[PDB]
Amino acid sequence: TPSLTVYLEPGHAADQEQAKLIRSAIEHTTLKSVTIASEIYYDPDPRSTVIPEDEEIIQLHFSLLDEEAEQSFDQQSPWLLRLELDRAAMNDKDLTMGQVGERIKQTFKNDLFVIWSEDNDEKLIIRCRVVRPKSLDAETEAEEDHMLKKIENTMLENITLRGVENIERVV
Amino acid sequence: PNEYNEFPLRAIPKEDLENMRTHLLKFQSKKKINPVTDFHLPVRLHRKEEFYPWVMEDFDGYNTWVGSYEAGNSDSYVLLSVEDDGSFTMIPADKVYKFTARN
Amino acid sequence: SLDLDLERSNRQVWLVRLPMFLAEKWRDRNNLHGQELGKIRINKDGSKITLLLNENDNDSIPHEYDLELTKKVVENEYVFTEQNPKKTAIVGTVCHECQVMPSMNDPNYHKIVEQRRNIVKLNNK
Amino acid sequence: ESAPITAEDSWAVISAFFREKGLVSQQLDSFNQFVDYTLQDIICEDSTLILEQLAQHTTESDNISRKYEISFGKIYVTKPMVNESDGVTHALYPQEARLRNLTYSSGLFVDVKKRTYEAIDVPGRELKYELIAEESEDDSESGKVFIGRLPIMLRSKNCYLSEATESDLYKLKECPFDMGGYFIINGSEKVLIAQERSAGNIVQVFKKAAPSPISHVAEIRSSTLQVKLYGREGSSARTIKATLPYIKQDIPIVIIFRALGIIPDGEILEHICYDVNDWQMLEMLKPCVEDGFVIQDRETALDFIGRRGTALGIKKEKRIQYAKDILQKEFLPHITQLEGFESRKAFFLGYMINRLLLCALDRKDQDDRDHFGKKRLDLAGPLLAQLFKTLFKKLTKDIFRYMQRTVEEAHDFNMKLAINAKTITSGLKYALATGNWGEQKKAMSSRAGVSQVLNRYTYSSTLSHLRRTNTPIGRDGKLAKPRQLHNTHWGLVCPAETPEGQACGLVKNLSLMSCISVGTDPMPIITFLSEWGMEPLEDYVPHQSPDATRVFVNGVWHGVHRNPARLMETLRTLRRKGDINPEVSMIRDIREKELKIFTDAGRVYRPLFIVEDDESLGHKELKVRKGHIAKLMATEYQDEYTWSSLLNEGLVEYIDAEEEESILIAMQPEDLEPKRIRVSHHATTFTHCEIHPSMILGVAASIIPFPDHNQSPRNTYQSAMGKQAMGVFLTN
Amino acid sequence: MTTFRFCRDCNNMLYPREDKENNRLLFECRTCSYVEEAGSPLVYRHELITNIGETAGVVQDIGSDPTLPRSDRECPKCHSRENVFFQSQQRRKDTSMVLFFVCLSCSHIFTSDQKN
């Protein structure tokens, strides 16, 4: 049972708030921990859906996407990482939806683009749609599920939103 | 409520069973298969003593069934053959075979 | 020896399960000559079925047993016969499934269960 | 006369119990079972020995092929006796064995028959042998071939001491206060201490810590089968793989079902999952279906099997046949061995993987490895059967080798010369004397301490020594859980009395009323069970009846059932009315809809009372009355009406450590009606009662006065020191 | 909640496939020629944490278990005062100590936690 005890600065020692900010800044946070439903769903035509809840989010970004995104509409995978994200876990680590959800994730490899809502919606729904070139081979393009399940697992497991490695808990 | 019907219990003698060896023919399917429509007569049944499994193939070869012997059926079943007089005659059961359709 | 005889296969056939001792006692060859050895009785509601053995048989066997229904509808079971490549002939389609148990009213039940005790005690392992 | 029962009646019943059974009954009963029944079967297993000598084709007269058949018959056992150096024979009695350093033993006689078959070896044709000569001396006393000498335990059925009265014991100069239960080897007294073992034919689900990819394991010992689930919880990748004997790489489960005979994919999940609605079960089985769907061929899997054998380069068809035979020969032998039982094996594999996956879905917990209901005790009987089987196998192998040797020289063999009768005698004597439970050549790696020299320092020390059990785990092994006292030891093990040092907790002593089961045949139980309305496992369809109780007999699934309550009531009626002997255990688990029946040997059971609801009194009460106690007093003073009289009337019942999981017991009888602090327990549906709490103690601690006013380690210390007092160890 | 669908021909589970010229989803059996039209764009589902209310498990014939306790609470439906009560039979580590009551006569399930 290894352990580590951290003493805060003289100014922040007597107040709980800076202590909780530091605690959030130390603990290891990964995507698999913050999704109440990171559900692998079929996303054949991301233009429209049957579920009314995500329909509201649809028109938000469809009127909020750049010209390059309009061109890349066809790159979005025929499957979706549909993220019903838990409000409590997201707010626990002081994790803003947009900046943390997309900046680092798209910066890492330019692999996964997202349609994401502002935190005010009652159901925090993100649509994670991976981005691939259209130059993909016909045999490759046929095996959509085969690439995307693997990349989805490598996505949940190997993306670090915030924190330092190997530290399971901070108290 | 005591009304009952009468079915006499008869049997089949040894002279008929000597040249009539019975075998329980069981087909594996999820659908009611009847040989009147699903089998085009005549049918070819052969073995290609229990080492060779049974093969029942239709005249056109569309309906081919392969049958294997399932052992350890501790229930010694009986066959109740209905005669012209409405009586039931007993036939002892010798072997049971289970059939499955070829892919 | 190839064609199947379906001219008289339309009639439904009962599927009854007999106890081991009773079934073995009914495999006797001497009683196979079309002899009338027993009778069945069906209740008006059909819930209770009673098998009564004819008095022509020896008094060493119980003359009363009861029947219980397993499935009210029985499908995808057929009865066939095979005679002298061998010539096969379907007998019919199965209708109901029933199972035989000994009757309490006939005291001979105890006797055979007594023999069952005789079976239990002798064999050891 | 319909009155309730007071503790005085409890002591009356206990007095009857000890007046009927005795304190050393377990050894005597195991020895009687071994001598009467198992000894015959050990030889009847390998009765026939065959030699097939083909024609050497040297000359025309050498074109005849020969067959030699050897068969065995009955076993006869004489009373112990000794032949001196002069050749005179006289019956041996324990005094002479003790004083003269002899060995208390008897002789064994077996019938032997021989047959010779001769056939004309015509090339290209099958050999047709015909009976020509048959030597069988059953009509003469010369047919009994002497085979060896077997030691005899004192006071057993064969021994002269069995029927001796007090004056008989005095004139032969016995101590009347001696109980038997020990051998005399080389003129010294030896005893066999019970050996503890983990039960077989029981599926057990374990768990692993996760530095490794393993997540869960399901074990069964019949030959061992391991069906492991790999993949962490919550991940996409689920793998289920089985490890068959003599197959190294291993292959998935859907491949097993395809090779086994269930081709359609939809039937696989009907085999595995018994509830249609549950979706997590099928979600975890999806990757197995996905991977196993690629190959609809048995023969690729059989080719997998064939390569990993020691022989290499075998033709494909022979590999197919070999892998086919492996399944019916070595895959789950405890269910069946002969051909054509595939449905049972498929359903049992489905049940095993179902239980593993259930534990994987947190609906249940790991199996407890300490539960005393999953442990058997081996007495003298089973150990002797083991050693006798080994030695008989070696002896018959030697006979075959010598007979082949003498056939090579074309010399007739004398059956009284081919047998080396000294093998059995020397092996048994060496094993009993040294204690190393194995062959003389391989005694180093065998079990030790199985046979110990009886301790006669004080009478209570002899009593404590003849009632001892050893748990064969390394006494320096640092596993704390086997050492500690466990909740299942109530009434079957003495909590106070245990050694100190390296054998703390590992050596156990029984209480005053914890007997052990002998063994009985399961076939009549199965026959009756199928008679009274049990549907066989062949005709079982999950969807037609998804609320069906499963039925087990000694750990092999035989089918299902629909109305189990009346079956349990009838079974217990028959067990209480003597139709079945009360050493058989019959548990029902309502929550999982299961029935379990045990008839094996090695189970510890204790007596208990019976509570039944009396409507005339308007509440529950025991079946025992003051009339039965008065009859017991009359019979005891007359020293009829004995303990078996109580047993066969359904007044007491033998309960092991497994049925106890499904009962309720009122400890004092007065607790069943509607200083210290005794609390009124809220229960009102009582089923049994404690005959007396004092019996939860052994023989050593039954001499401390007021033991409950003492700290427990003090009771342990005195239970240790009670074996070093000086006193009259025997009156002779 | 994705449900397995079996082919009507050989009972094998149906694999998804796409129709580009009509842009519609179908389920096909890889062994035969059967093809069926998908009714929803929901084919697979992968939840992570289970927000399942604790369940009493098997209830059938639970009143004949004599090692199960009793209580005198009154039935909310049949107004009977005899019933069996037990804790949640799902063995999660973090399960609360919330009781479950099964009525003796009407076999009605309820809990001691009457949260509105």
Coordinates of C-alpha atoms in Angstrom, one line a residue, chain A residues 32 35-42 44 50 79 144 149 152 156, chain E residues 1 16-18 25 40-49 51:
Chain A
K32 CA -14.1 5.9 -19.1
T35 CA -19.4 8.6 -18.8
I36 CA -22.6 7.2 -17.3
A37 CA -23.3 5.8 -20.8
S38 CA -20.4 5.9 -23.3
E39 CA -22.7 3.8 -25.5
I40 CA -21.5 2.4 -28.8
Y41 CA -24.5 3.1 -31.1
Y42 CA -25.3 2.8 -34.7
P44 CA -25.7 5.6 -40.0
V50 CA -35.1 9.3 -33.9
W79 CA -21.3 4.4 -35.6
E144 CA -16.7 0.1 -40.4
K149 CA -14.9 -0.7 -32.0
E152 CA -13.5 3.3 -29.5
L156 CA -11.9 5.3 -23.7
Chain E
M1 CA -31.6 -1.7 -25.3
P16 CA -26.2 -5.8 -39.7
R17 CA -25.5 -4.5 -43.2
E18 CA -26.1 -1.2 -45.2
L25 CA -30.2 -0.8 -42.7
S40 CA -34.6 1.2 -35.8
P41 CA -31.1 2.7 -36.1
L42 CA -30.4 1.1 -32.7
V43 CA -28.3 -2.1 -33.2
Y44 CA -25.8 -2.2 -30.3
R45 CA -25.6 -0.7 -26.8
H46 CA -22.8 -0.6 -24.3
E47 CA -23.6 0.9 -20.9
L48 CA -20.9 1.3 -18.3
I49 CA -22.4 1.8 -14.8
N51 CA -28.3 2.4 -12.2

